[PDB]
Amino acid sequence: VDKGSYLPRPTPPRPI
Amino acid sequence: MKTYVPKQVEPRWVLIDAEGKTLGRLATKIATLLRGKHRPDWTPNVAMGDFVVVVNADKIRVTGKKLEQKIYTRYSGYPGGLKKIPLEKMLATHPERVLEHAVKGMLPKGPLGRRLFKRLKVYAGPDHPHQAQRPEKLEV
């Protein structure tokens, strides 16, 4: 069932 | 002065007729003999107890309704792998395991307890193969 959404949609970073 | 610690002794072999005796009350004694705590020079970090031979272990006796109600249990590691076996059936199929399981649970866990367990020789029927060792008949 649709409830909240406690996190943004993710995306990977870039270390260096 | 420091406490006496014995040098290795010749262990004693022992014979017990399990017939008609109560499962747990017999097991209790078999364990003690195994640990050798009947010996005045008892040492907790070495095997110095007796070898215990038991006969007529199929004729062990038990109180209450435990023939039909006591459940021995085994988990195989697989899903739904818990097998259940009642006393009655265990006696019918592997009677010596009854007395063996009881005793094993009353031994210490760990490397020594496992060794002490191996010095236990249980048989169904009145005969045992160790007359070579000439075990001394015990009354318990």
């Binding site: - | 195989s76 590691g77 697989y78 899903p79 792998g81």
Partner: protein, 204 residues
């Protein structure tokens, strides 16, 4: 219980009452008894059968001894049949008459490292609609923190075939004793030239 060793030679169909019937032909005879197992000696009842003649150049001394005590020429294969005690010193296809039902054991064909789809008939992944490098993949293998592990016996990729298989209750369609031949209805495990065992069925 009765049984014989044999080799799988090949498949055909024959005609019987205006019906085509798929058969697998098996070269079974002849099998010399080379040892008997007895309750007083071994604790159970069976007959060790030899099969196929071997160049005695390749049979070592411990094996030579075994054969000699049975008064039997060197054979390539030894295998037992439990609860079988032929009155004879030699076992042939004649122990099976047409209409009998049999159990045939062989060594299945080996697929080596088999994907979860070939091995376990998994559905695999979709082939379009965004499916990402998972077209032949098995999916989830578990749950989460509880139980936080994977069950024993989880169907997974791995070796497949080249293992002992028994197909049961096959009709004996014919037997051609003069060629040590057995015709069995249907399919038998393993490749042509494969060692197989034929036993009287255990179904009723």
């Amino acid at each position: 219980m009765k049984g014989i060793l044999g080799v799988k030679v090949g498949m055909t169909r024959i005609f019987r009452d205006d019906r085509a019937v798929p058969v697998t032909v098996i070269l079974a005879g002849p099998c010399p008894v080379v040892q008997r197992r007895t309750p007083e000696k071994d604790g159970y009842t069976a007959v060790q059968l030899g099969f196929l003649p071997q160049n005695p150049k390749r049979v070592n001394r411990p094996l030579k001894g075994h054969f000699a005590k049975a008064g039997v020429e060197p054979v390539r294969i030894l295998r037992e049949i439990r609860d079988f005690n032929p009155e004879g010193d030699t076992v042939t296809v004649e122990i099976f008459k047409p209409g009998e039902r049999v159990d045939v054991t062989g060594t299945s064909k080996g697929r080596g490292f088999a994907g979860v789809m070939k091995r376990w008939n998994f559905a695999g992944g979709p082939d379009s609609h965004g499916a990402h490098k998972i077209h032949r993949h098995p999916g989830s293998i578990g749950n989460r923190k509880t139980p936080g592990r994977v069950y024993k016996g989880k169907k997974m990729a791995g070796h497949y075939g080249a293992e002992r298989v028994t197909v049961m209750n096959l009709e004996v369609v014919d037997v051609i004793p003069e060629e040590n031949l057995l015709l069995v209805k249907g399919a038998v495990p393993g490749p042509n030239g494969g060692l197989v065992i034929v036993r009287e069925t255990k179904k009723a």
